[PDB]
Each structure stands twice: as structure tokens, then as C-alpha cells.
């Protein structure tokens, strides 16, 4: 049927399998996080830029700076952590786009997984250089770099 | 024991080689996936043929 | 840039790493190929006293769980009386005026089903933290991440050839061989053949 | 459509293998960072370089106290630099104050 | 009906239900993929028909 | 085989120095491990290269 944990136990026990092929292992790995929309990309980009400016400001005020108030230093570290959390979240969101693009350059010379890894490195560069105020979607910019 | 192989041997000991032996055998660390310059056919610097 | 296991001592007809560390080859392929975490070290005395303090923490958390459970029960009773007021005061079918009653009953049943499932989750992670030991594999990534971000002390655990290198680091051949000599001295049957 | 005749890319000469005299040569002692010593026999009239790429695989310096100070290049590109090339300090400070007010409203409201 | 072998297997079947057979087929033939009631509906009809 | 090991080692070093999430670095390390295993004995574990 659809309940009574028979199908649920079957899906759970089939989730914890070997999958000796490394490509199938990586695909089952990356099919995990939830995909995003343009509003989520806007939110994550704003959080990333805020965290980057906060950690650069803390880098400035670390040497020759100030013993800051405890709340100011604490939420400065909070924004500094939140920026990297958003960056990891964005990269892990668009891994699937890297896979879907790199499925077509196979069959000649290189192996599949090396193409996937080079696409991931291009996606790192695209999420570093992406801008949100130009009002475009993230795949529109990221396809160039990938 | 011997390393110039003067054909005076009495043993041949095998052994499980550690990283301290591996980086003691080697003469230089290869760090580039290149073999030969495509135009002048010379062995590349820091390649597999350096 | 990261250590790598030699293939002759991992995949043989006896697997020599498996016989040395007493691991199953099915488990060894899960460890050294980034399929499953492995507990490489653990504490004893910190676990011994935070056993009491963290079981107090666990009882506090499960008390809050049951508080949210009977709060869901009270909200179900409130919505059930609302269904009573909007059913048994007008003209309707006697089965259709209890259809919302049965829907709220099955809603309470699935709500306590969810609550009992996360109760099982908390009981599982607490029991696993009590029975934590070295050379133990942890499949189900979510359980390991929950265990780590709750109990980042008391143990370390990695995944791969670095973790295998840590296991070979924390290792004595003398007491292991003496235990095996004791087992082939006194034991019997299958365990004697395995110990040989 | 020919004969398989191979040749390695290199010539083989044969001259007199005499060891009774050679060119005179020095020996320079190079040192890496991790307590390693290396000997590289250069010739006598040879401008000995202050650094050297060692046999171990890391850039070792020369054990004589030359102190060359080669003045290495900048780190190429940062995420902060790619942010700063398209934003300004007051706009980044404005978003910083925005996130500060948001974490304040989440913390105590 | 006549086959002693077939009635012995139909008593030793230990599974009742078409979907109950389909989930076993999918979990043994697939394994490493979560089953759903449209995939086993299409997997067998893709393999032999 | 030597070029595959050299490529994946350089890429792993660049990913570690760049700062990448755990998924990419773990997949890269299992890629390097599979490449060295294929160097020492191709066709031992899984599909031969």
C-alpha cells in the first residue's frame, strides 16, 4: 500500500545500500538538499555579502582595533558564520545543475567524474562572482562559468 | 646491503616499504601531468619525464 | 594530499586490514570509500558523569516532548468540541456530523504517531551514545550529524583512510596478540578458528 | 606501411670514461624549512643561487646568511576583492546594519 | 490446480497482494533506489513488454 | 594512470586550499583513492578502467 511503514521501511533500507558505482553514489549523495527559487537566491546572496563585509570589517578591527562590546563581537561572529553557511548552502544547492550540464561533455577523453569536479570548481567561481542586483536568475549567470 | 650489484649476493629480503623509505628512494617530486613538449619534443620541466 | 589505502592489503581473499583490525570487509569498504563514518576514539570518565547529567537532559527533553504531545491533545479536544458545535446543532447526517470527529481522531492518531517516531529517534540516539565504542560504524548520516552536534565532546569520528590511519595509530599488537593467545587457549568452535 | 624502428628522443655518444681528472667543483649546502639538509655540487665558477628546489620537493634556501628577501607577489584574487569591485563601503555597511537589525529582532525583538 | 508443485508454492508464497509482490520485485531487482507505486507499475512493463 | 593520479591530487589540493563543502572534498578524495587503486591493480574492485 502507501502506509503502515512497509513501503517506508523498504525506502529506508534501500537508502542504506552499498552502491559500489561511484557515480551512482555521488548522485544519491547530491539528490538530498532542497532546490531553491529566485527569492531564496536573493536572500542567500544578501547574507553572503553581509557575512563577507562583516568578516572583512573584523579583519580590519582585529589588528590595531578595539576591544568591542560583547554583543557586537558576538553578532559579528554570528554574521561571519552565517555567510559561510549560506555559501555552502548555495553550492550544495546548485551541484545538480553542474551535473546536468556536465552530462553532455562525456564520451571523449575525460571521465565523467572529473568533468563533474571541474564543473564544481567553475560553480565555486560563479557563486563568488554572482551579483543579485541585476535581477537575473542564478543559472543564467552560472552556465557561462560552468 | 649492495646497491651496485657486483653479483656477490647471499640474500634477497623483501619488506613492506614505508613513506620514509619512499621519499628516500626518490630524487625529485613530480608535480605536473605533462610528458613532452608538443613542438620541440623535449621532456617537460617537472613532468613525468623531467 | 590525503592518505590512500594500498589495494593488496584491503582486497584479498583474506583481507589483511580486516584481520588486523577485526573488521568485516563489507564494513571496511564502507569506511575507506567514504560510505560510512567510524568512531575512531571515545572518552570514558566524561561519559561516566555526563551519563547522569545528560540523562537528566534527556528526561527534560522528553518531558518537553510529552508536553507538546498533550498540548496537541488539548488542541485536538478544542477543535473536536468546535466540530461538535458545528455538527450537532444543525441539520446534517449523523455519519457526516461524525466524519469530522473521525478525521480529528485519525489526526490525533497520526500526530501521536509522529511524536512516537521522534521519541524513538531520541531514544535511539541516547542509547547509541551510551553504547558508543571504538571501531563502530555509523551509517545513516543524519544520526551521526545529530550525535556530533549534540555531543561534540566525548569522542571523535572520521571517515576514510585518515580514520583507518588513526585506528592503526591507536593500536597495540602485544595485548591484542595476548588476548588472541588466550582465546585459542580456552575457546572452542568457530571463535577458535577465527582467532587462529 | 614501414618497419617498426623506434628511437628514444636522445642521442648516445661514447667518449673516454676517465675519472683521473674532472673540473673543480664546490658543494653548496641547501636547507629547507623542516630541518632538512641537502648538498648540490655546483662547479667552481658558478653563480650559486640563493634558493634552490630541493630533492625533497620543497623550496630550500641556502645555509649562508644571505637573506635575499625576494619580495613575493600579492595573493591573486579574493572573494572580498570581487565583492569590493562591484560594491561600495557604504552599501556594504548598509546591508551590515540591515542584518544587524534582523539578528536583533530575532534575538530580542 | 493439478500441479502439486504449484499448490505447494501457492501455499509457500507467504505474500498476498499485487502491490506486495511489486515492492518485493522492485526492492530485489532495483536495489539502491526507493520504491514508489508508479515505478514498479512501469518497471515490469518496461522490461518485457 | 599516473596522469590521472597527478590531476586528481592537484585538484584536491586546490579544493582544500580554496575551501569547499564536505560533499565535493569527500567525492574528490574517493576519486583519488579509486585512481590509486586502479593504478596498482586495474580491475580488482569494480569495473576495470
From Swiss-Prot, chain A:
Stretches for region Sigma-70 factor domain-2: 90-146
Subcellular location(s) of the protein: Cytoplasm
Spans annotated as Sigma-70 factor domain-1: 20-54
Transmembrane segments: none
Highest taxon, organism lineage: Bacteria
Motif Interaction with polymerase core subunit RpoC: chain residues: 114-117
Domains: entry comment: The sigma-70 factor domain-2 mediates sequence-specific interaction with the -10 element in promoter DNA, and plays an important role in melting the double-stranded DNA and the formation of the transcription bubble. The sigma-70 factor domain-2 mediates interaction with the RNA polymerase subunits RpoB and RpoC. The sigma-70 factor domain-4 contains a helix-turn-helix (H-T-H) motif that mediates interaction with the -35 element in promoter DNA. The domain also mediates interaction with the RNA polymerase subunit RpoA.
Function: Sigma factors are initiation factors that promote the attachment of RNA polymerase to specific initiation sites and are then released. This sigma factor is the primary sigma factor during exponential growth.
Subunit structure: Interacts transiently with the RNA polymerase catalytic core formed by RpoA, RpoB, RpoC and RpoZ (2 alpha, 1 beta, 1 beta' and 1 omega subunit) to form the RNA polymerase holoenzyme that can initiate transcription.
Family classification: Belongs to the sigma-70 factor family. RpoD/SigA subfamily.
Protein name: RNA polymerase sigma factor SigA
Organism field: Mycobacterium tuberculosis (strain CDC 1551 / Oshkosh)
Lineage, top ranks: Bacteria, Bacillati, Actinomycetota, Actinomycetes, Mycobacteriales
Gene responsible for this protein: sigA
Residues of the full protein shown: 206 to 351 of 528
UniProtKB/Swiss-Prot annotation, chain D:
Statement: the UniProt record of this protein carries the keyword Transcription regulation: yes
GO biological process: positive regulation of DNA-templated transcription
One GO molecular-function entry: bacterial-type RNA polymerase core enzyme binding
Keyword line: Transcription, Transcription regulation
Classification via InterPro entries: RbpA_sf (IPR038638), RNApol-bd_RbpA (IPR025182)
Iron among keywords: no
Signal sequence, start to end: none
Pfam families in UniProt: RbpA
Family: Belongs to the RNA polymerase-binding protein RbpA family.
Oligomeric and partner information: Forms a complex with the RNAP catalytic core and with free principal sigma factors.
Annotated function: Binds to RNA polymerase (RNAP), stimulating transcription from principal, but not alternative sigma factor promoters.
Protein name stated in the entry: RNA polymerase-binding protein RbpA
Swiss-Prot record, chain F:
Membrane-traversing stretches: none
Disulfide bonds: none
Span of the signal peptide: none
Highest rank taxon of the organism: Bacteria
Quaternary structure and partners: The RNAP catalytic core consists of 2 alpha, 1 beta, 1 beta' and 1 omega subunit. When a sigma factor is associated with the core the holoenzyme is formed, which can initiate transcription.
Protein role: DNA-dependent RNA polymerase catalyzes the transcription of DNA into RNA using the four ribonucleoside triphosphates as substrates.
The family this protein is said to belong to: Belongs to the RNA polymerase beta' chain family.
Protein name: DNA-directed RNA polymerase subunit beta'
Source organism of the structure: Mycobacterium tuberculosis (strain ATCC 25177 / H37Ra)
Entire-sequence positions represented here: 343 to 391 of 1316
